Write a protein that binds this ligand. Structure first.
Ligand SMILES: CC(C)C[C@H](N)C(=O)N1C[C@H](O)C[C@](C)(O)[C@@H](n2cnc3c2c(=O)n(C)c(=O)n3C)C1
Ligand SMILES: C[S@@+](CC[C@H](N)C(=O)[O-])C[C@H]1O[C@@H](n2cnc3c(N)ncnc32)[C@H](O)[C@@H]1O
Ligand SMILES: [Cl-]
Ligand SMILES: [Zn+2]
Ligand SMILES: [Zn+2]
Lengths: 301, 116
């Protein structure tokens, strides 16, 4: 009932526990659009609701936080989602974004190129991805796990997400990857969150809350995506913009979460318990250095 | 001795009846903020809209060098408050107007330092 006053709807735990088979996604409210406040873009609204939901979880929020945002450019040449993330994150948070095509951004640094060309020396506290190829919405072909940028994202998380860190990765009916769902089991908690403003779409953000660096739970990703679609197919979400009108508690609280460098082998059950509670980040606190690989070619004669 | 003058070109285009630059990124906020011109987080008051700064910067949006001899952008990475009556052209507004160095309000749209 009250779901219309929330920023969106997270997949209830019982649907996560099913063993459904994958079906086509048929949303009753398909094609409907929410009424956005005057002059507000869908992507501003969408990221605001995502951030409002993230405010309800046990995110670690250290001093000198590091956040990276893939898929940040729009067809308009600007980065609406980055602008919302920077509003949401504490002032001074280091924010890097990236996209295939050129765009103008408020991030501290921007890398233009395929995500597979992005390398970073440091680990990150939060990874956001809006990466999406609309050519995947081919309803006439079978819906298999996709590779492409999802393969990169899975490796990036395992190699460069700090222990205690969190992610939010955009998926849809056809844009999904089984190993990414499997990796959700390496977090203390996970969900698939649907924004109320975009509830007529099969889009969701797959959210991993507090990374543990090892499986807490064995998740079959083909089954979990079928479970996700089953949920969407059987649970119409009323489009709603209601939460956009109350921003008083929007900013992410600067928790000053502790950061420690530790070697694998110092990670005991007390450490894992603190990681699982949003009370600790494990990574080095060096300087943040990034780069984009550039392919060189000379096309002459 | 030649440099492109983008400011003047946009001012002349506007006067010629041209459509203001679009897709400036408008933020959701309380509209109970300080009303200062350029801030690290949205600060629109009741008579303003807040926008992501890069999207309101002529030089950022046109992919040209900033006039600063060092190339630094006043707006990028910040939020700009624009009077609601002028929010159809934030880029025009930020170009044409000036921030009071004392109180941080826009000259003539919040700055009262020059009053008795
Ligand atoms: C605007 C109307 C309400 C359309 C109505 N809903 C409808 O009649 N169709 C007929 C099709 O045959 C397929 C389907 C599954 O019945 C409907 N549909 C429902 N959810 C969908 C779709 C869809 O295509 N695509 C591509 C999606 O991505 N999702 C999430 C669309
Ligand atoms: C929905 S859009 C971006 C919306 C954007 N976040 C916003 O805030 O308006 C999807 C984006 O994902 C990007 N992207 C898609 N595939 C990519 C890939 N292999 N590598 C890097 N970026 C990709 C696209 O260029 C595209 O801009
Ligand atoms: Cl499972
Ligand atoms: Zn600029
Ligand atoms: Zn003044």
């Amino acid at each position: 009932s009250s779901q219309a006053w929330q920023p969106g709807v997270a997949m209830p735990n019982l649907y996560k526990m099913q063993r459904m088979l994958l079906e086509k996604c048929d949303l009753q409210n398909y094609g409907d659009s929410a009424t956005l406040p005057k002059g507000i873009m869908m992507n501003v609204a969408k990221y605001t609701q995502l951030c409002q939901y993230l405010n309800t979880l046990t995110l670690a929020v250290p001093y000198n936080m590091r956040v990276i945002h893939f898929g940040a450019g729009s067809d308009k040449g600007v980065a609406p989602g980055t602008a919302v993330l920077r509003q949401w994150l504490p002032t001074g948070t280091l924010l890097v974004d990236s996209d295939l095509n050129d765009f103008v951004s408020d991030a501290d640094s921007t890398l233009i190129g395929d995500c597979a060309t992005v390398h970073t020396a440091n680990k990150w506290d939060l990874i956001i991805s809006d990466m999406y190829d609309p050519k995947t919405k081919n309803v006439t072909k079978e819906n298999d796990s996709k590779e492409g940028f999802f393969t990169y994202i899975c490796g990036f998380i395992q190699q460069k997400l700090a222990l205690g860190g969190s992610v939010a990765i955009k998926i849809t009916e056809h844009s999904w990857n089984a190993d990414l769902y499997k990796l959700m089991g390496h977090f203390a908690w996970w969900t698939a969150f649907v924004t109320n403003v975009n509830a007529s779409s099969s889009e969701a953000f797959l959210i991993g809350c507090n990374y543990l660096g090892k499986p807490r739970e064995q998740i079959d990703g083909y089954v979990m995506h079928a479970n996700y679609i089953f949920w969407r197919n059987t649970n119409p979400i009323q489009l709603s913009s209601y939460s956009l009108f109350d921003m008083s508690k929007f900013p992410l609280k600067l928790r000053g979460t502790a950061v420690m460098s530790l070697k694998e082998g110092q990670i005991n059950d007390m450490i894992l318990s603190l990681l699982s509670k949003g009370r600790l980040i494990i990574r080095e606190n060096n300087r943040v250095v990034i780069s984009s690989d550039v392919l060189v070619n000379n096309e002459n004669l | 001795a030649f440099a492109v003058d983008a400011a003047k070109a946009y001012k002349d285009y506007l006067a010629s009846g041209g459509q203001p630059i679009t897709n400036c990124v408008k933020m959701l906020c309380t509209h109970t903020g300080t009303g200062q011109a350029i801030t690290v987080t949205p600060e629109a008051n009741m008579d303003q809209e807040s926008f992501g700064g890069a999207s309101c910067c002529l030089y950022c949006r046109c992919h040209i060098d900033h006039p600063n001899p060092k190339g630094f952008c006043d707006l990028k990475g910040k939020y700009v408050q624009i009077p609601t009556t002028c929010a159809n052209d934030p880029v025009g507004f930020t170009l044409k107007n000036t921030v009071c160095t004392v109180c941080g309000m826009w000259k003539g749209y919040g700055c009262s330092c020059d009053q008795l």
